[model samples]
Target: MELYRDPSQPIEVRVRDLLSRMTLEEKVAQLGSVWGYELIDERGKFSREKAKELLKNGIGQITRPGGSTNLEPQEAAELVNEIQRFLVEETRLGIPAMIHEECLTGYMGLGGTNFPQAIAMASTWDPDLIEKMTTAVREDMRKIGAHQGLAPVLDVARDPRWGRTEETFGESPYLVARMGVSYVKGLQGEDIKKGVVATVKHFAGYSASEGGKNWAPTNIPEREFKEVFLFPFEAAVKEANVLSVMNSYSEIDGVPCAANRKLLTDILRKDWGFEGIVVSDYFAVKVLEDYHRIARDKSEAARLALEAGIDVELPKTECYQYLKDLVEKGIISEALIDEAVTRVLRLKFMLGLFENPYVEVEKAKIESHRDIALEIARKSIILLKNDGILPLQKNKKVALIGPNAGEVRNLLGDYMYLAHSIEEHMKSIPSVLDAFKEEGIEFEYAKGCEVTGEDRSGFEEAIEIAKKSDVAIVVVGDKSGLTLDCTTGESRDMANLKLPGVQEELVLEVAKTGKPVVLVLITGRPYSLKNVVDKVNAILQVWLPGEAGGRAIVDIIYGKVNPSGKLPISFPRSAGQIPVFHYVKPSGGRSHWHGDYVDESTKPLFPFGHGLSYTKFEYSNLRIEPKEVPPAGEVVIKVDVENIGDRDGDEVVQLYIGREFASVTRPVKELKGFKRVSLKAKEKKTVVFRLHMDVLAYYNRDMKLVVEPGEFKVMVGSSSEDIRLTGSFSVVGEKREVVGMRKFFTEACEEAAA
Candidate 1:
């Protein structure tokens, strides 16, 4: 009979009625989340007694029921159902708690399908495939009774040294934005009630950490910060209508993101018009007082976060739990509590939680690691270097050597179901050697060295095997996890970007055997290739390719699938060149003479957007329509891309633009549009890019975004350094400030030539 319980009422009305009925304590409780494992017994089963105690005041959300507990898919779903039943039936408010899981690489749980990492996903340059992969993520999460996924890390990874690089899209804001929008659209499908709410995270500018260290302070200029770091977030929020956001731990300009009202409130909510609930990163609320030292105590931290627009404290209620005491003492207003509670209630109503909060366990069980995961894994393998030495003959005796060759655990990145699990379940996932054997290929396997260790004891045996074999496939690179064995992932920051321990030594020893060496890197972050680029005959960067990585890699090696994935992040020649990312300002020259490190060349080992294919792609006939157009008008750019080689493959046609004259400095070039084209042997395609003048707009000295009258060069290239065709366009008329709604993506169309 309660108005709040009526399904016929509007969501706003239901939320308002529910808010009016909640007491001050209940309102604060709705703004705080609890860890899932804490509500379960020692055996990883949900305890009814613990549920009654935790859900007494009605919690806002449940954190990682699948990830934190490592429960099987059905077990996770059943546990979620039991918790929902208790919350809806036993609690006075009967509010169902939102269950959230770490879905960065599929649903983070036992038996959940593990897809490729975010960086690998971006390498495909196919947002449609990214969307499909996350669609599986949504179904798997929804089946497990999860309502939200804290994933699709939109951070534009500028520093390869950052341990979390594997979790980001790439260095370009436009690329990151495109991939992020697709991920959001996929995870949050046509209906919110049917799909999991995708949480785009770290909020703004977390990846540009000082010295590429996790949670380190970042001091980016206002213009660069807005254009580069904030670009992806604005696109995801405005375009995708992403339902949730999480605060980062980094501080910009001496203000921690957790307490930065200008960022959380002014920009995110007021400017970009994000209306979703803002959840704090795990313990980020407490870090305000404990780490940032901006707040004096837990009460002040709670007050600052609530007032700054953090709707909920996550993982545990460390700071926000003190909100009731602070409000009673008039230290904070009850209105702040009411505002947050309203947002949470609105989301619950939008999810139709009142009507049905349980999921079909049988239906949910079938969504994991099917054809979709394998296809993404296949598409994510990048052929970094090839010298006609790949596509190894199946009859050749192969020596599979190095730390990553036989280790299934090394194939997944941090936050994946297997990698995040507390125990090792490597037997379930096949290794590269196992995959090769599955295809009836003759191969000898030896882990030449561990991911990180000083031991060279196994190198001699690896070298001996290489000497006898016709080919050597060295699988090196990192182990991604939060354990001691982990060489990459969060808090696993590396001061050196080299092959860890004796791995580089192992590669050199094997290469000395005079056999064709294929270097396969299974890493979370890009490693310096200067030491081994010429030592190996071929190189493939299979960046933390998930459960199906072994199969995908074997397929590429055997030419079953052509490698089409490009470098989402660049590989630096040395650790000294930390910020070797493409799209640097014109004045920011790379070299010993031009403000670069004296000991090293200021160039990347491989440029961004660089990847080789079995087939050769030729670019020609670049043309631009309306050579001189008004500042507000649109321009059409056309380029002819031909597959001249004998194999059928996909090519990512990239369009970049540079402002020749500007009041403020601009990057040498920035990616404007890109299209993934599939071509048969000797096939040519005319790719047309429709770029509005808004793509040329930049923040001037006055901090106003505008497209000034100037000459701009449109370059068509396979990579940033490999421009095959170039043309120019002029923006005529007076300068115009772009306001109101704007387009985030440049529309591109392609037609195959006869």
Candidate 2:
């Protein structure tokens, strides 16, 4: 047996031995990927003949085996088996291909589970739950013989008008970093051979699009870029040791992210120590020529991407196919091709694909994770407002009106297979109206208006229904997808932050019935609520709560579940107040005049971390061990939380800190640690945080990460604007520069109260 084929050989030995036997054409071929459809016939069945045509030289990856087809999980597994059989048995090299799929919310297939949107997951403030959800996702993916998931988008939400806001963790780098590390750890479980590869994607500045338009250039200073946009990625690479990365379809500071050496190589590889392969976002290489206008043709785009360290070209090869000619011309060296092929082979060998490429088709039929999905949806539900009219009695009638109430499709984010490609098969999933029926709640139904339309002919029927009902439940907000009917999702950027079309109007008309109004917003992004805050008796922000969204919403309405999720991103009063968020620099929101705007408040309609719970939570007993510490030392901060309300509930204990003196400017406050704790009535607990001074490190004027000696304030709060307790600590030592895998997450835990 060849050294490469021996299972006992080290991965480096296997990679080197395999790479030595390959010719230039074969080596270059390993840099390109094929779409699942290319190997399948018109009827969606794998064709051995097609496989021979595509896999003659051995391919790098097979993109979306499950997501590209509407087959049962068993059939998908069999299909993967057939392709691996072709590569191993028929091809000259007998090297298997890696398979990747879109798993933003779940497996992104009909047979897999669909959980809540990423923003919704962030709202829960529960990283353990996030890890649990992705762990369940990993099992379903491995059953289908899929290797990688292009998800856990780590883009910090800088603007809500950006269409893909629902896919982000939040506006805070610390929050995004915490959630992203857990997401990677879960999807890439203890044994990566058993666990699927988790790909942290849209790397570096996809969410901070110009004018909030999709795929636009991002322009921000170096400090904000490194501190804010690159924070999560550094954490993912250093903390989680993530296996793969997908480039953003963005141009940061006039350079496309796909071709930015400083981003993809200098920082990602050298600085943060990321050894994983980098995959291009769909058609991002081609965008360089047609969109970014940096490259002259396909040949140049290929050279730029390969030289910039993108290891694979995905979704059918268009540009990486030019690597052979570029290498011959010596414009791109053959050594570059070998480096990429080595990385790909290392992953395949590590996964044990050579010995066990085939999986049991029966194992693909694992039970669905709907129970876990229901739990995620429940925790993701946030009560933005309440006027003591919630937990409605079943005996009371509800006039369920508006666009989102009756549509299962609206419950899912854009990436779910049912939403992206979903629902004759997904009819099993319940709508809000269906959930209400299952709960034995009496209700009248009317889609008073479409998600986006001028037509209001159906309004009067909704008005008439509201007049006879005890309460009016107006289910408003977005329809998430990439289709024309969708009001939110990727490439569906909005010009305004208000409710689309006649949704706000529909709510106003329903409120005129003089009945108590309950507003439930199922949006992909936060929308302005200035006009309707006073008219509604209650409001819920269930941001695209996956397949079980309907049931989750109903349970919260009847008090079966307490709404505990917080706002990951702030809601602006209008689109004009574009960059509003908590933790801004002291200079912002001050306006150089009065703190208030002449026409509107210089504040968000809802601040970051703002979410109302059915029960009240109290914070007290601030404690800081050691009032003064060295710049390199650790400090322990603790606070006591008590559930003061009558019912059981959960509270998100937030810890924030600000530097009083520094050579560089900083936000008024920054989130350092947080924990979500559950307590019954009159119960209390102490939440403790062990903060390493390295977490306080920032980019100096010379661009080095450091912690300066200064007075720092520790503030504990329910929300960013709701500080309940404050204490001060000082760093007594001289300035210390932190280098090499500095700390990002602040360790937080819960303890029994005294």
Candidate 3:
């Protein structure tokens, strides 16, 4: 050990020295933020007038240049690079500003690969594939000179009506955590170089939006909060070493998350040992006083959020700009400002930003690898239901009818800056119609219905076209936008979550013509459609398939590719039966009509992990080795699946863990692991799922992950609600505790028979 407290210097010592060298004003300067910093004009400059006023006291981070406001990828990168250079060279302390982008579905920039929304990815069930996808996302963002990716939303899907449901993986702690962790690892990469810092989102509960509304308050209890909502962030912080965190937009139990010290400081920092920056959700600091009404003024709101350990206020400086004023007036402490600044600077250093202040942007990198993105999108589009009406002959005149058929703008989801919003943005996209034209397949079309509102004007034209054509490709579903009135998002909460407008009737009318109609649904969230499932010749659920959406659909519809995409969230029969999942306590009750609805059975239209491939795969030879083992041991389950179809296809081999009659109510099945194996036509493979004691454990009464002695079932299945085979194993003796304590389960209590 070096003497004299190591001035030659350990990082902590150097950091302490640096902190000591700064004045109170200089320290306060490091705690501020700037909003819309990169979305300035084509001059490749941010508002110099505003920058003069904003950067005087220095800034912590810049709010979404690629998001919030629309900036072309190249423009955004150039702006960010310039801003960072200015902050480093011109500012008093020469502290560079950290630039971040919303990678919710790839960076929210032009030409970026917007993969299947989060729920769609959950359906993939392959962590390795998710990691691969996120790695690509990281590369794309890095190419644009971005340093941080604000993504991998770990909020569990509790309500389907939630507009942001498409933004999350489904409602399971493990599913959310593992996928989120993989994405974090992918985005951060092996060495945290040539990559961005992955931020685990909405530290606590948010998916349980009020009435399934966006940014609505949630009243979650403590147990549910810890067990269900907070589980993913815990994994991200402890396991992944994710350097950044973002708070939820909700106010839980009368306290705004942006200002709640119990969650921000007490639980997240004190209990979990999180040593990262806690940034605010967009304009969340300002919302504390405006939306939550917890603080009387902007200064008070800033004070509360910072004290609660919010390191950076994001998007805009509505209230955060008051930090310096607040400290001067003794409304908030200088120490609070210093703590946040220290954490923020530490993250910048950790990102290696000081060494390489600018990530060199290549203009060609802005336009992504289109062919690969299209192929992945093609594989991701799930074929929901089919009656052999797909692969429509090109010889016969085709009728592609729907609001989305000719509407290329429907190709982009909400996050992308679209022509629909920008007047110059021509509705030009890779349309299915365009794809057919490229193949020289003549087609006729009708705007069957708008995505929302009651507009039956186009239905008659659609019906007439259907009568003449060999088959109809009936396109229906959500148009990604902010509110329901303009487009289908939070505003269009249906009394019966059916297809909007006269579209359902249009679909049924075409089906009644005795013509084979292929129902193609392009949406963000899942919609309940029993009628279409029953009547359509084929149904394809393409959840906002991004830039390559149209080409992917054409490939699948024409049998050019086999569909392997599965459902991440279950399709309910009705919205009244909200919060429905396939893994509920197995009962005749959840099936038909014991305690279920009189009209619609509680059963889902399609269960989780369910998807149809052009080819069928058969599963047999299921076995579990060393069936009886001590609690400390592991088990290996092996199964063989044969591709029985004529064409080459891929299958997601799913593994689930469930207790055989536990004392407490355990889920019917929980997904533990899965692998997507691709095989050529007539190819067969042996799939192995390694089950360790960790996979077989659950939370006991004392809140520890324990593998209790008894029987455990390993289900090798096509989907969660539909298993092909089952095998059982028993724990020999006393329960043993495993790593990362489970948030659910209890001891076997011998209670009197009910």
Candidate 4:
């Protein structure tokens, strides 16, 4: 009896046995993948001819089997089963290909539940909700036989001009790490057998590209790389034990992440002890040769990637196919090929793919579009600005205008079902128009202008409606997808952060109507809101709130739900102020020495963590325990927060730390801890945070990560700019180096108080 076939065998033992049985061609095949749609025929069913041709040597993974064909839950399951059956029955090794889907927002397929975009979810400041949302994603994907999800973009979005900003948690490393850990835990679940393998993408500094251009070169210093860019990825790997990591397309300090052995192996494996497989971003290996000009040919690209520890080449392999030839020519060793193959086989076996590769089709249909998705959508709505004009009167006449006013598809982000073209069969998932109609709200509608275009013909009609109505609610900003209609998502980098083409002009035009204009923005990234901030009476930023966003928007507008979401990424005042994120070094001026920009101020329109609640919150009684602590010790902080307003609501109490004097300069203020609490009118709560010494550690000028013993300032607030209470704490020990594991999050505990 083969040890590899025995279910009772250890995963490493099974992987080793399987590795010994595979031939050179078989090993190379395991390192490559095929696109799902390519394997299907005109009938939208898996082609036996194609499967025989593609699976003859066995493939590593199937890319978007459900999404590529827009298959219904059951159809997706059947197709996946067919593909697996062919590989197991027909192939020499019977190695079932791992099915991977684009699951940044839910499962990214037909019948999949669409949740709010990553940025919006981060705005909630609720990691538990994020976990719940991804749990639904896991259930749906697993039922459809998808074993892997390329999601939970761990990139800390520093530039709003980058279209993929919508896919990140936020600019703060701590918050991004918190959300990333929760996301990984939810998708991967408690066990690999029952969960989908979460693949964290754009690994290490993909978001800090020059000029915020997609796939552009990254030029951050080594210290900033560790503290800002690599912080979340480290947390995800150490805390959540992320199963796989996808390499970023851009080169970091001249070395591409796909070819940088220091990032892929030394830091990830030797320093951090991450044992998961490292997969290349789609075509990233080839781009090293074709785009970056780093490699001479496909063979060299493949060699660089393999040596750099890229275990798999995804979305249809090109460069990885040369691995076999390289091994034969003795340029690359067979042992190195075996190493990657071993990692892949280990994950497959750990996932129990060899035991049961099929899924219940009917189970998947029942799992999609659950109430949790809608609940998260509701929690993600942010009331950016209001002049006591929100919670519209029932009797008031409303004029709803703009391209996104009633469109259901516009509510989803890049990786969602409708946006990614996975569920074309479904006409629409309830629109904002549907919500307003159902709520019995008296409203007139007009599409003032396209999301992106140079036309103002309909502007007159929209203005006419606004003039006649008591209030005007203009829904604007971004259509997320990968096609021409898309203004945001991967490869959709923008040079300007303004409302795309004439939309701002349309907005300013509507604001001229004299009626109270409530601007409802359904955007993927934070735009330069300086143009219309003073023009509109109320502003709502609903960042691609997903399928139920329409309902969430109407509910918040009508006082059915209170908006509590905050700005994860800061809203730049102008496009030129690209890195207007709050956590900048002390020297990074908020304003110039003599004066600000001649055109605009250096300050952002909306600072990071800025959000307004329908009900107000008050912070007081800040306390710190054991004021002085050693490098290895922890500090305890406590603060009192009250819902001082008339209505009940939720408040995100944020804790930021400032190092007065350090070995190196630090951000003006760094977010170290936060807690979301719900309180009734006049109710108070005590929030406690346990912050470790490692949270204060940073890489000094000499590149040594250490905590300098000095006075540290702790500020408690609702947002970065809104400090309510302040206290001082001190680290008393020597400036010790953080060579081992470091804390990624603060232990936050909240209790109700009188």
Candidate 5:
């Protein structure tokens, strides 16, 4: 476990020697984190008092020093340098601290580029594009001297009621895994900087909270947990080589994941071979004693977590403070401390903390990245359901109605530094109305209803305003905040997941005005808008794009830009179909069947991966290189893509794999790969996709990814169900023995007995 000594030698050798020199305390100190609560300044600057107090205990990582609030990249860089210098210069061991921040939607901060929400990215369904975006996010973070990005929220969305759905990839394990692997690789490059790390989060079952409530206990059977929830994390740990795991706040089957030894040690470490460090979520360690009630006291919490294979107590130490005392009290063993600390120091060595601890910020690099983020934001604006009424003329007097009008903050999704923990620290944001003003358009604004409250006195006035305008652009959706309290986030989960409060009623009232209403659904999660989707003239889903969201919305409305964003998840017709994702058992018993409620059917309000564009595109001429190939081989598929519409548009070229025959029930369609290609009017392009052998495989009863023989269909389309082109190939003859890279694949088939 020794990770440093003979400083002149290679890192591995020096790491080994160094591990031998440290006592248990020194090693354990490297695992805990100093949360933003202590690190952030009163005026949103880094505080020296908080830093010294937290680091004096030998804190391993600094959480959200930049993330506590949005600061200029230069300011963030200065803080990073100052903290790093203090850690190396003042700490007894001269060990540098690792800096971590949230990057759910681009750097998670103020003045930072805010990409579209997580669901919007899922809509795009392009792993390569997501990889490129996260890579861009990484360079931005690293440039500011951030050591770790606490992101790529791999939790599969099952309950839309969970307000934080904006933070996760989507519903399918394969889909989440695909994106999760992409982000992990991009965040932690093949090479590590002096003091940076990329931490994958919420080890397991964090997303499936009870009753779709955040931090509530999640009740999941062991089988479903392994098959659905755990699949993505397993893929990340084994294939992506994710260096650290953050424990979930929710308890699994009445046991807190932080105190549950079986999940942390047996399943995650022993079964999955996750050799890297395992850190608790913010305050999760304290929850073991205070919230979960599994432990009698903080000391007991520390005792159980160490035994459970939790190496670091994150966000602030409560239990770890009593670890040394507990060992002397015979409640724990010294070996546990040594083993945990060994991995901690190994991470430090891997992060190159011993070499160049200070990462200097380059101020000039920040502004240039704005153009890149805007381009990404442009591609992420999914057109869920659009009628011919789009491309409104700029000269038309438009009624911009809703709570979101003129609110720049509405343009930013929750989790951006300015949106989440630090929203109050910033000033005004840019809104669609603001954009129209810049464009010299006369637009009327009205608050149809409050985001979520008993306030509808303005509904009549809203209708009157709409009646006078040529077209009504009603911007309606949830507000950014925690669930249950400040309007949204994990705080609010409606029995009905449509427009909140009297917004729907207001929309109905506006419809009576006889004006052409272009309903702009500016939301975080997909709304079950069966009533509005068909009633409105146009429905543009401008999912919480960042600062330039107004500009993007105005561009799409005025035909200055074309929307190419696609749905990453399904829009269920009702709350009953909560777990609806793109992939499900192939047209089986319950799903896609004729069974129906007395009043309703099983159809989704909008299908998974559904998105419309301003212009039309067609797919045809599908071809597969080989009719059959060995299990180890790959097949290339080609499809002709043409923009047949009058205006230029973007097409989300989606690839799906279906097992014609399987030993076990399989999802009807699983997204294998995707690409977003922009096309000019009447232009045609041949899109080629390499169907690697890995895409042809699935998890069998043994949980190993085996390429089962029979027939497999490769479907190309605009969305999950919109298959415009199709081709078939077989994994003929014997199953191949190529192991492939363990860190890049989803799950390993359990090793067969000798």
Candidate 6:
């Protein structure tokens, strides 16, 4: 009996045994995939006759089998089982193709659970909730027989003008790393056999494109790119041990991530020691020839990608099939092909695909997805601005206006199958109006204007309703998609960050009626809020929350649940303040809050970590035990937070570190630790933070991560600019260096205190 077929053999031994058993065509076939639709017929079912050609030598992966068809969960499972049976029965070797799905916000399939977008989840600042959300995603994908999930975008999105900003975990490296790691952990649970393989995507600076244009040239320097852009990717590999990585489409420093060996190999494999498969972004390999113009032909493109350590070419065999010609000409070595196949085969074995590649059609029904989706949706609501106009009085008359006020598709972000699955295929989703009606809220509704159009026909009706009502709830923001009409999504880059079409004009028109206007924004990225900050009494930024988005908004508005989410990305005043993130350096004009502009201040409309609750929180008693310590020593910092307001609530206590004096310039303040604590009215809790020396370290002039020996400033606050308490600590010893899996997170624990 072959060890490759044995269940107990070591993964490497099995991979070697399997490699020896494959022919040249079979080896190359393992590095490429076909679209899920390619093997399906008009009836939305798998056809062995159709798949026989694609799987004759056995394909590596099947892209979005659940999402590419109109099949239901059980139907998709049945189709996947049929496809696998053909590979097992027809192929010389029974190598089952790994099935992948778009699961950025849960599974991107019809009837799959729709969770809040990434930016919205990041605003929650509760990693536990994020993990719980993806655990549901894993269960759904598993039931549908999907082995790989192309999700959990790890790009540190600094520019909101980038359409996919909503896909990332916000701008800060610490926050993104924390969220990305948790996301990978949740998707790839303790036992990968029971969990779906999570693909941490767009390795290294996909979001920092020039002019914030999607797929444009990345302009970040090497140091900043490593510290900021690569931090999350590194954590996902080291902390979560993610099974796969997808390359970014854009080129960094004139080298595309798909063809950059320094990024894909030297750093990824040698430095951080990543053993996972590196898959190309959809069509990225071929784009190197036509789009990037770096490769002379598809053969050259295939050579570059393979040499750069790209293991798989996703969505199709496009350029990777040329690897055969290169190998025959001795332009590329056979060893390189073996290296990639090993990763793909190992991951497939790790997923236990060889043993059991099919799902139970009866058990394919989703479990408690809506329940967890609602929980995350509720935690993701951000109360941006309020003048005591929210938590509306039960007797108040509400006038709901704007295009998103009652549209189900507008509630979702980009990549949600419910929204992108052609509007007709969408299921029952409660609109903001629908939720308001369900909650017994008195209201009149009008669609003031479309999300993107020159029409103003309904403005008079919207204004008339506002005039008669005590308060007007104008729900307006972006409709995410890749279509030309869509204002947000991949390739949906916009020049201006304002609300699309005449929605801003409609808000101004309605506010002229002398009514308290509450602008509820439903968007994926932060917008230029300068236009309506003063016009509306209250503002809510509910980033593309999932199915229960309407319910979460209404629940927070009526005080059924407190608004605790914070701004993961700063809301710029306008596109003029393009790179206005909170990670500004000490000498980079960060000290002056409003120094960057003459006509308008450079300050963001809402700074990072900025959010409000119905109740207030107070920070006090800041203490740094052993304020002076050695470079390798740990520091224990403590602070007290009290719910001083009349109502009970939750507060996110943030700890920021400042390099008072260092060899290299550092951010004015960097977030090191944070904790979200729940408190009853007049209740108090002491938050203890165990900060290791490595958390305070940074890449020095020599490119070594060193804990600089100097004075360090500690600030405890509710937000980036809201410093409540401050203290100083010193690294008394030498500037020591950190190497090999540096601890990036500060251990934070909270307990009740008198």
lDDT of 3 at 8: 56
Per-residue lDDT of 529-614 in model 6, one digit per residue for the tens? 78789988999999999887999999999888888998888888888777788878865633365556777777788999999999
Q: For model 3, how does the per-residue alpha-carbon lDDT over 53-103 read when each residue is reduced to its tens digit?
A: 677556777777666456677667777777777776777666677777877
Tell me how far the alpha carbon of residue 445 in candidate 5 is from the true structure, in angstroms, after superposition. 1.7
lDDT of 2: 0.88
Model 4's alpha-carbon lDDT is: 0.87
Clashes of each: 0, 1, 0, 0, 32, 0
Question: TM-score for every candidate vs. truth?
Answer: 0.98, 0.99, 0.91, 0.98, 0.90, 0.98
The 10-residue segment of model 2 with minimum total lDDT is 421-430
Candidate with maximal TM-score = 2
lDDT of 2 by residue, 487-560 (tens): 99998988888899989989999998889999999999988889999999999998899778999999999998
lDDT of each: 0.87, 0.88, 0.74, 0.87, 0.74, 0.88
Clashing pairs in 2: 418-422
Residue 7's C-alpha lDDT in candidate 4? 93
State the displacement of the C-alpha of residue 316, model 4, in Å, after optimal TM-score superposition. 1.3
On a 0 to 100 scale, what is the lDDT of residue 32 in model 5? Answer: 72
Better model by TM-score: candidate 5 vs candidate 6: 6
Report how far off residue 127 is in candidate 5 (Å). 4.0
lDDT of 5 by residue, 617-718 (tens): 888777787988887777777777889999888787878888756777777778776667768898888777776686455566666667777788788898
